[PDB]
Amino acid sequence: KQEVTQIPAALSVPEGENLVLNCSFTDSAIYNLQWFRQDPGKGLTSLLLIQSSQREQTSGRLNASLDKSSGSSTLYIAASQPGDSATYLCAVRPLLDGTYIPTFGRGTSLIVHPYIQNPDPAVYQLRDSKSSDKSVCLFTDFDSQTNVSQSKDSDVYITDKCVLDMRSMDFKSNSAVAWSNKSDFACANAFNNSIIPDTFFPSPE
Amino acid sequence: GVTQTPKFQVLKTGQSMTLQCAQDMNHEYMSWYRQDPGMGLRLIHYSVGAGTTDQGEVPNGYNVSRSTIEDFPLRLLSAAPSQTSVYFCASSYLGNTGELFFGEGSRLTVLEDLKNVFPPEVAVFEPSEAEISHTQKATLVCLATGFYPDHVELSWWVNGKEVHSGVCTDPQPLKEQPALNDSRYALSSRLRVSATFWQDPRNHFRCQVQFYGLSENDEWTQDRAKPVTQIVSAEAWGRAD
């Protein structure tokens, strides 16, 4: 019986590059194949639907092909951008009739990294507005090749990295937050992982 | 379109609940799925038209009915902890060619004890003087901590207007206790502006988190306030140079 697999499970790529997502299915007898996009905390958005006897289907930068005989489809995303970051799922439906149950793949988790023209890695410590002696560290402006690893300390936390775009000045940057529920602890030390040697670590004072 | 309600819900093991799903597109086919980490979308029930429904891959613990073409509710008589998941409703015309349409999803968390429900503590951290001087930019950080379940919505408000420019929030919150499935969460967001906008004392920044918790109809016998659906925020004003 039908079984759909998507590869890769997770794809990380620099913007500007074209992307290729694959979805294979055991049974070539399908009425149609459909690609969806899902953003964290949101539902599934339909991208493309390919009829059995159509072969190709376009939608701007999204181009989807389907080889029924081989039993596989490919989603082509041209000139990718950080906005394409999301999980991609393909689903297929039985051509049979009397049965309309589709089958979903596990999906490909995609991440398109931003182009950082001028990398300027640095960790800054911030203070709480309420002034409760609290603070947090901010690792920002690093190139998109830099990876942040979760700290190996009990009371220390590090978030994943996100991209923020300052529309007004056409400036986008990467950042990662770190803090510790420790009594008087320098959070800058939470980043003891694999960062750039030229990373700026100004003293909090 | 397809509309599911509610979008967020917290149940106590044993309670009943009905998830609604409607569409005004006149689709004869409607179905329910549940999505779980590292296990994908699994069909619960489906209906090919009014007066008819069928079991899916995992129909146990759920009931459905299709008296009208427009609606297709999912019922849970005795809520079980295992039923904690994200539920989706999908519809299409039974004249294949018409795509499948999904709702926004319903996030249901079933608990053995509602005392594991905690609201978030929110705090905004003001821009470092090192960043401003080095980049002529300022990044405010909002940190929401210790909440459970993961039913939150974080947003920034500057001078009364929700902003999306110069903002990124963690796509997903991190567990404060990695090994527990009942772990409380933390979520952060960044708001970056020009140093001059931050240095203006009349500029008002506000970070808020909408937390979906208990109802006013649930029991609660503890000294700390009941963690009902609420909004928790923190704020900060620009600071002159």
3-state secondary structure chain A: CCCEEEECCEEEEECCCCEEEEEEECCCCEEEEEEEEECCCCCEEEEEEEECCCCEEEECCEEEEEECCCCEEEEEECCCCHHHCEEEEEEEEECCCCCCCCEECCCEEEEEECCCCCCCCEEEEEEECCCCCCEEEEEECCCCCCCCCCCCCCCEEECCCEEEEEHHHCEEEEEEEEEECCCCCCHHHHHCCCCCCCCECCCCC
In this structure, chain A runs to a length of 205
Say yes or no: A131 and A79 in one domain. Answer: no
Query: If you search the block for the tokens 């020009």, which residue do you land on?
Result: B194
A163 shares a domain with A94: no
Residue pair A21/A64 in contact (Cβ under 8 Å)? The answer is: no
* Residues A45 and A98 grouped into a single domain: yes
Instruction: Say whether B174 and A104 touch across the interface (CB within 8 A).
Output: no
Q: Measure the CA–CA gap between A40 and A95, rounded to whole angstroms.
A: 32
How many domains, chain A?
Answer: 2
Domain coverage including residue A61: 1-114
Question: What part of A 136-175 touches B (C-beta under 8 Å)?
Answer: 136, 138, 140-141, 157, 159-160, 162-169, 173, 175
Interface of A with B in 2-41 (CB under 8 A): 31-32, 34, 36, 39-41
Judge whether B50 is closer than 8 Å to chain A, CB to CB: no
Domain co-membership, A109 together with A171: no
Fold of B1-112: Immunoglobulin-like (2.60.40)
Q: Are residues A22 and A121 in the same domain?
A: no
* Distance (Å, whole) CA B6 – CA B19: 7
Indicate whether A141 and A197 sit together in one domain.
Answer: yes
Tell me the chain B residues in contact with residue A166 when contact means C-beta distances shorter than 8 Å: 137, 165-166, 192-194
When CB atoms are compared, the residue of A107, A129, A200 closest to B236 is A129
- Cβ distance B143 to A163 less than 8 Å, yes or no, reads no
Q: Could you tell me if A20 and A47 lie in one domain?
A: yes
The three-class DSSP label of residue B16 is coil
Residues 6 or more apart in contact with residue B57 via CB below 8 angstroms = B42, B43, B44
Last residue of a domain, one of A60, A95, A114: A114
Residues of B in contact with A188 (CB under 8 A): none
Q: Do B1-112 and B113-238 fold alike per CATH? A: yes
Residues A149 and A67 in one domain: no
End residue of a domain, out of A63, A91, A114: A114
Q: Structure tokens of A117?
A: 């023209």
Closest CA to A161 of A110, A196, A88, A111: A111
CATH number at residue A133: 2.60.40.10
Q: Are residues A128 and A76 in the same domain?
A: no
Decide if B158 contacts B141 (C-beta within 8 A): no
Contact A144, A14 (CB under 8 A): yes
Tokens of B207: 């970070």
Instruction: Classify domain B113-238 at the CATH topology level.
Output: Immunoglobulin-like (2.60.40)
Q: Which of A124, A164, A167 sits opposite B131 (nearest CB)?
A: A124
Which residue, of A82, A114, A146, is where some domain finishes?
A114
* Dist CA B152 CA B154 (whole Å): 7
Residue A176 CB neighbour total at 10 angstroms: 24
Q: Which residues of B touch A44 (CB under 8 A)?
A: 88, 102
Whether residue B227 is preceded by a cis peptide bond, meaning omega within 30 degrees of 0, is: no
Please check whether residues A103 and A123 belong to one and the same domain.
no
How far apart, in Å, do the first and last CA atoms of chain B sit? 51
**B66 bridge partner residues:** none
**From CA A114, how far away is CA A13, in angstroms rounded?**
9
Q: Measured between alpha carbons, how far is B204 from B1 in angstroms, rounded to an integer?
A: 38
Is there a single domain that holds both residue A91 and residue A47? Answer: yes
DSSP state of B99: P
Closest residue by Cα to residue B233 from B139, B124, B97: B124
Same domain, A138 and A69: no
Element of type H or E holding B197: helix B195-198
Angle (CA) A6 A12 A13, round 5°: 115
Distances (CA, A) of B85 to A168, B9, B10, B36: 40, 10, 11, 6
- Name B50's Cβ contacts closer than 8 Å, sequence gap at least 6: B28, B66, B67, B68, B69
Cβ-Cβ contacts under 8 Å for A57 (sequence gap 6 or more): A48, A49, A50, A63, A64, A65, A66
* B198 three-class SS: helix
Tokens 């968390």 belong to B109
Residue B148: burial class (beta carbons within 10 Å; 0-12, 13-18, 19+): buried
Beta bridge partners of B34: B42, B87
Interstrand relation of A108-113 and A10-14 (parallel, antiparallel or unpaired): parallel
Q: What ranges do the domains of chain B cover?
A: 1-112, 113-238
Q: Structure solved using which method?
A: X-ray
